[PDB]
Fold Coiled-coil Trimer with Glu:Leu:Lys Triad.
Amino acid sequence: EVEALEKKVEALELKVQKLEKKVEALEHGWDGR
Amino acid sequence: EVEALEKKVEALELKVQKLEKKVEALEHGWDGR
Amino acid sequence: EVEALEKKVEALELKVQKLEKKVEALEHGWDGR
């Protein structure tokens, strides 16, 4: 169902963005990490 | 191909869940991390 | 739009691969991590 896939992709995109932020934080040692 | 996209989304969802777990582990310092 | 969803999935797949690499690096302590 394309409409439902679209929702899942949109959710994954935000999830991946948030992971990218946390992982760049850990890699760079931002804020005592 | 919607059917193939569906499989890729379903795989990504599990991959993102597993990443979310590991990243929350690293952020929280679970188990000596 | 399936064509656009396909592009987003393909981008997410690479993003998730790269995250998987960085996270396995952090988990394993590769290279001083």
In short: Chain B touches chain C at residues 2, 5, 8-9, 12, 15-16, 19, 22-23, 26 (CB under 8 Å). The radius of gyration of chain B is 14 Å. The CA atoms of residues 23 and 29 of chain B lie 10 Å apart. The helical segments of chain B are 2-28.
